[PDB]
Amino acid sequence: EYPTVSEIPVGEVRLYQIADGVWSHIATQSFDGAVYPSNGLIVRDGDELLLIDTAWGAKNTAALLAEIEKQIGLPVTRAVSTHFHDDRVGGVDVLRAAGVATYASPSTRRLAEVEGNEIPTHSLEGLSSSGDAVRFGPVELFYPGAAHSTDNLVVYVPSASVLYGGCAIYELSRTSAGNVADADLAEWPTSIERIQQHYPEAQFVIPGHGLPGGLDLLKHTTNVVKAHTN
Ligand SMILES: CC(=O)SC[C@@H](CCCCc1ccccc1)P(=O)(O)O
Ligand SMILES: [Zn+2]
Ligand SMILES: [Zn+2]
């Protein structure tokens, strides 16, 4: 029932309802000769929608906006990118062209600029130290410390007990670290520990790629990272 990579041609986007007023969005994109699925989040914010992460590329993000208009019909008014790589900020220009106010931490904005990626317009203050959390409409943003990247944020929806880990959290079936180019393998288990401490009550955990699960994904990810380290 959760859509898989084989079911979503590149350029199409699926919406999956996780709880009332909470959806994931699922897209697919080419990376180094293979196509991968990728998740983001959509959260009802009163009469508006809060978007967490692009759909990995301009074309996919446009399809996401279209699918949202068709299936939900509320405007996306704000978007947060959880780190600076293309699967998270690629498409920010499309969001801005459609009237969406784009946000990310100062760190993410700077790293995106250096990388030559699209740059979210607005900075999110209050997230510069490991353990920092801030409220952002219907969600809490949390910086757990360096993991998949040094800037990676996670997102909690308190009304639904949904934890979106982004690329810091792996799906259960995944045994192999992916692109760990900007990763901090030594810090990553500690950062997961911070997430586990801060959100002990999470009922649903959404990884950056693949199938949703529960808090068991946190331990699974730590095991995989440590294996790539041992
Ligand atoms: C999310 C990651 O692991 S890094 C993001 C890169 C894409 C990563 C896809 C890696 C992957 C490998 C195996 C299964 C799922 C995803 P990009 O810099 O092109 O946005
Ligand atoms: Zn990344
Ligand atoms: Zn990713």
Short mmCIF file of C-alpha atoms and ligand atoms in Angstrom, two decimals:
data_model
loop_
_atom_site.label_atom_id
_atom_site.label_comp_id
_atom_site.label_asym_id
_atom_site.label_seq_id
_atom_site.Cartn_x
_atom_site.Cartn_y
_atom_site.Cartn_z
CA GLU A 1 0.00 0.00 0.00
CA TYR A 2 2.88 2.45 0.56
CA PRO A 3 4.09 3.15 -2.94
CA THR A 4 7.47 1.72 -3.98
CA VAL A 5 10.21 2.89 -6.32
CA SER A 6 9.14 0.57 -9.17
CA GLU A 7 5.61 1.97 -9.12
CA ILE A 8 6.50 5.66 -9.56
CA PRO A 9 7.92 6.74 -12.90
CA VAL A 10 10.45 9.62 -12.70
CA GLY A 11 8.48 12.85 -12.92
CA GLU A 12 5.38 11.53 -11.06
CA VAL A 13 4.54 12.14 -7.42
CA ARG A 14 2.40 10.11 -5.03
CA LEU A 15 0.65 11.40 -1.90
CA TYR A 16 0.10 9.03 1.02
CA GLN A 17 -2.07 9.94 3.99
CA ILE A 18 -0.33 9.12 7.28
CA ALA A 19 -2.89 10.70 9.63
CA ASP A 20 -5.50 13.43 9.59
CA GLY A 21 -3.86 16.47 8.05
CA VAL A 22 -0.53 14.66 7.51
CA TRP A 23 0.70 13.19 4.23
CA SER A 24 3.97 12.00 2.90
CA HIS A 25 4.95 12.75 -0.68
CA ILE A 26 6.87 10.17 -2.65
CA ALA A 27 8.91 10.83 -5.81
CA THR A 28 11.72 9.16 -7.72
CA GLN A 29 14.94 10.42 -9.27
CA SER A 30 18.18 9.29 -10.92
CA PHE A 31 21.38 9.28 -8.86
CA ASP A 32 24.62 7.84 -10.23
CA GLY A 33 22.96 5.39 -12.61
CA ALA A 34 20.02 4.19 -10.45
CA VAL A 35 16.59 5.53 -9.58
CA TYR A 36 15.67 5.99 -5.93
CA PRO A 37 12.42 6.83 -4.15
CA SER A 38 12.38 9.82 -1.81
CA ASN A 39 9.93 11.00 0.90
CA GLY A 40 8.82 14.38 2.14
CA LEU A 41 5.94 15.58 4.36
CA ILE A 42 2.85 17.74 3.99
CA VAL A 43 1.15 19.06 7.10
CA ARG A 44 -2.14 20.93 7.30
CA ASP A 45 -1.54 24.37 8.80
CA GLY A 46 -5.04 25.73 9.30
CA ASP A 47 -6.23 26.76 5.84
CA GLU A 48 -2.71 26.38 4.37
CA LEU A 49 -0.18 23.59 3.87
CA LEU A 50 3.32 23.33 5.26
CA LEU A 51 5.67 21.42 2.97
CA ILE A 52 8.72 19.54 4.30
CA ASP A 53 11.29 19.11 1.53
CA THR A 54 10.99 19.27 -2.21
CA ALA A 55 10.29 16.25 -4.37
CA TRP A 56 13.93 16.04 -5.59
CA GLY A 57 14.17 18.25 -8.66
CA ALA A 58 12.24 21.03 -10.41
CA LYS A 59 10.09 18.71 -12.55
CA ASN A 60 9.15 16.46 -9.66
CA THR A 61 8.38 19.48 -7.40
CA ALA A 62 6.07 20.89 -10.05
CA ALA A 63 4.27 17.54 -10.22
CA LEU A 64 4.02 17.62 -6.39
CA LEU A 65 2.34 21.03 -6.49
CA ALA A 66 -0.08 19.76 -9.10
CA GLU A 67 -0.92 16.61 -7.18
CA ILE A 68 -1.48 18.69 -4.06
CA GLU A 69 -3.87 20.99 -5.92
CA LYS A 70 -5.77 18.03 -7.37
CA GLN A 71 -6.02 15.89 -4.25
CA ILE A 72 -6.03 18.47 -1.43
CA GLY A 73 -6.77 21.87 -2.88
CA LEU A 74 -5.17 23.93 -0.09
CA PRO A 75 -2.21 26.22 -1.02
CA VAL A 76 1.32 25.36 0.03
CA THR A 77 2.42 28.61 1.64
CA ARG A 78 5.68 27.65 3.40
CA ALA A 79 8.34 24.99 2.79
CA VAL A 80 11.24 23.78 4.96
CA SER A 81 14.25 21.98 3.53
CA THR A 82 15.82 19.55 6.06
CA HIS A 83 19.30 19.62 4.50
CA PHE A 84 21.20 21.11 1.59
CA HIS A 85 21.33 18.26 -0.93
CA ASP A 86 19.30 18.19 -4.15
CA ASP A 87 16.63 15.77 -2.92
CA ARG A 88 15.70 18.41 -0.32
CA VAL A 89 16.24 21.81 -1.98
CA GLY A 90 16.05 20.90 -5.66
CA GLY A 91 12.84 22.54 -6.74
CA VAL A 92 12.93 25.49 -4.35
CA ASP A 93 12.87 27.84 -7.36
CA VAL A 94 9.65 26.13 -8.54
CA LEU A 95 8.15 26.53 -5.07
CA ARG A 96 9.10 30.24 -5.02
CA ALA A 97 7.65 30.77 -8.53
CA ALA A 98 4.36 29.27 -7.29
CA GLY A 99 4.24 31.69 -4.34
CA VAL A 100 5.70 29.46 -1.58
CA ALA A 101 7.91 31.02 1.07
CA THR A 102 10.97 28.79 1.41
CA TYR A 103 12.89 28.23 4.68
CA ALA A 104 15.97 26.46 5.93
CA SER A 105 18.56 26.81 8.67
CA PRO A 106 21.39 29.33 8.04
CA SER A 107 23.70 26.32 7.83
CA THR A 108 21.63 24.64 5.12
CA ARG A 109 21.36 27.89 3.13
CA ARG A 110 25.14 28.38 3.24
CA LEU A 111 25.96 24.79 2.33
CA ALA A 112 23.44 24.85 -0.50
CA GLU A 113 25.04 27.98 -1.91
CA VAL A 114 28.58 26.42 -1.85
CA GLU A 115 27.28 23.24 -3.47
CA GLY A 116 25.72 25.30 -6.27
CA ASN A 117 22.19 24.15 -5.28
CA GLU A 118 18.97 26.13 -4.99
CA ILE A 119 18.81 28.27 -1.85
CA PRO A 120 15.73 28.59 0.39
CA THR A 121 14.90 32.29 0.85
CA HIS A 122 14.38 32.58 4.64
CA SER A 123 16.59 31.53 7.52
CA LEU A 124 15.34 29.49 10.46
CA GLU A 125 16.85 30.90 13.63
CA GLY A 126 17.24 28.87 16.80
CA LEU A 127 18.65 25.64 15.37
CA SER A 128 22.44 26.15 15.45
CA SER A 129 23.35 23.77 18.33
CA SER A 130 22.79 20.05 18.65
CA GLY A 131 19.60 19.56 20.66
CA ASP A 132 17.98 22.82 19.53
CA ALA A 133 14.25 22.77 18.75
CA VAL A 134 11.85 25.44 17.53
CA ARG A 135 8.15 25.48 16.74
CA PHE A 136 7.17 26.16 13.14
CA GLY A 137 3.40 26.30 12.77
CA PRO A 138 2.02 22.72 13.17
CA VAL A 139 5.45 21.07 13.59
CA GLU A 140 8.55 21.17 15.70
CA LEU A 141 11.91 21.41 13.97
CA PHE A 142 14.79 19.65 15.74
CA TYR A 143 18.54 19.75 15.02
CA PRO A 144 19.95 16.48 16.38
CA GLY A 145 23.55 17.15 15.38
CA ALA A 146 25.58 15.93 12.45
CA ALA A 147 24.57 12.67 10.87
CA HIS A 148 23.83 12.18 7.20
CA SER A 149 24.96 15.80 6.78
CA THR A 150 26.11 18.39 9.32
CA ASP A 151 22.96 20.47 8.83
CA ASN A 152 20.27 17.79 8.82
CA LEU A 153 17.01 18.59 10.61
CA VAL A 154 14.19 16.28 11.68
CA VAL A 155 10.54 17.27 11.98
CA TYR A 156 7.90 16.20 14.50
CA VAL A 157 4.13 16.57 14.16
CA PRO A 158 2.88 16.59 17.75
CA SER A 159 -0.82 16.23 16.91
CA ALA A 160 -0.14 12.98 14.98
CA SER A 161 2.96 11.65 16.71
CA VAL A 162 4.69 11.58 13.32
CA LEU A 163 8.48 11.88 13.21
CA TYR A 164 10.06 12.70 9.88
CA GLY A 165 13.76 11.78 10.04
CA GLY A 166 14.75 12.72 6.53
CA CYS A 167 18.00 11.23 5.29
CA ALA A 168 19.33 10.85 8.85
CA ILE A 169 16.97 7.86 9.26
CA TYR A 170 17.04 4.72 7.10
CA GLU A 171 14.15 2.43 6.23
CA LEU A 172 14.13 -0.96 7.97
CA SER A 173 15.06 -3.03 4.91
CA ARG A 174 18.07 -0.85 4.04
CA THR A 175 21.36 -2.41 5.11
CA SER A 176 23.70 -0.22 3.16
CA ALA A 177 24.67 3.36 3.84
CA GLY A 178 23.99 5.49 0.78
CA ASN A 179 25.71 8.69 -0.13
CA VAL A 180 27.69 9.39 3.06
CA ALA A 181 29.83 12.03 1.35
CA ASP A 182 28.96 14.82 3.76
CA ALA A 183 28.15 12.45 6.62
CA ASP A 184 29.71 12.35 10.09
CA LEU A 185 29.75 8.64 10.84
CA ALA A 186 31.22 9.09 14.31
CA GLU A 187 28.57 11.62 15.35
CA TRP A 188 25.59 10.00 13.60
CA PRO A 189 24.76 7.44 16.34
CA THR A 190 24.92 10.19 18.95
CA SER A 191 22.58 12.34 16.89
CA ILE A 192 20.09 9.46 16.63
CA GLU A 193 20.36 9.13 20.40
CA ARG A 194 19.24 12.76 20.70
CA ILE A 195 16.25 12.07 18.46
CA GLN A 196 15.32 8.98 20.46
CA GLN A 197 15.49 11.00 23.71
CA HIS A 198 13.48 13.92 22.44
CA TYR A 199 10.64 11.97 20.77
CA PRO A 200 10.06 8.85 22.89
CA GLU A 201 6.34 8.90 22.07
CA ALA A 202 6.62 8.88 18.23
CA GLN A 203 4.14 6.45 16.67
CA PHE A 204 5.16 6.83 13.01
CA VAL A 205 8.72 7.35 11.73
CA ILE A 206 9.27 8.43 8.11
CA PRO A 207 12.72 7.79 6.63
CA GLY A 208 14.18 9.94 3.86
CA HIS A 209 13.78 7.06 1.40
CA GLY A 210 11.49 4.08 1.62
CA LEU A 211 8.91 2.62 3.90
CA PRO A 212 7.58 4.31 7.07
CA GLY A 213 8.00 2.44 10.36
CA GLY A 214 8.26 3.05 14.10
CA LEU A 215 11.05 3.98 16.51
CA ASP A 216 12.75 0.74 15.52
CA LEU A 217 14.16 2.60 12.46
CA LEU A 218 16.40 4.65 14.78
CA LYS A 219 18.20 1.62 16.21
CA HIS A 220 18.30 0.05 12.74
CA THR A 221 19.99 3.13 11.31
CA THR A 222 22.56 3.24 14.13
CA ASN A 223 23.38 -0.43 13.47
CA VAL A 224 23.89 0.18 9.74
CA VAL A 225 26.05 3.28 10.26
CA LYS A 226 28.21 1.51 12.87
CA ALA A 227 28.67 -1.44 10.50
CA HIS A 228 29.98 0.90 7.83
CA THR A 229 32.28 2.14 10.62
CA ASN A 230 33.39 -1.28 11.92
C1 LIG B 1 19.57 10.66 1.01
C2 LIG B 1 20.92 10.13 0.75
O1 LIG B 1 21.25 9.00 1.14
S1 LIG B 1 21.92 11.36 -0.11
C3 LIG B 1 20.97 12.26 -1.32
C4 LIG B 1 21.41 11.95 -2.72
C5 LIG B 1 20.56 10.82 -3.28
C6 LIG B 1 20.68 9.63 -2.34
C7 LIG B 1 20.03 8.35 -2.78
C8 LIG B 1 20.78 7.25 -2.00
C9 LIG B 1 20.05 6.09 -1.80
C10 LIG B 1 20.72 4.87 -1.89
C11 LIG B 1 20.02 3.69 -1.70
C12 LIG B 1 18.66 3.75 -1.40
C13 LIG B 1 18.00 4.96 -1.28
C14 LIG B 1 18.70 6.13 -1.48
P1 LIG B 1 21.23 13.53 -3.62
O2 LIG B 1 22.56 14.34 -3.19
O3 LIG B 1 21.43 13.19 -5.17
O4 LIG B 1 19.99 14.27 -3.30
ZN ZN B 2 21.75 14.22 1.50
ZN ZN B 3 18.02 11.70 0.79
#
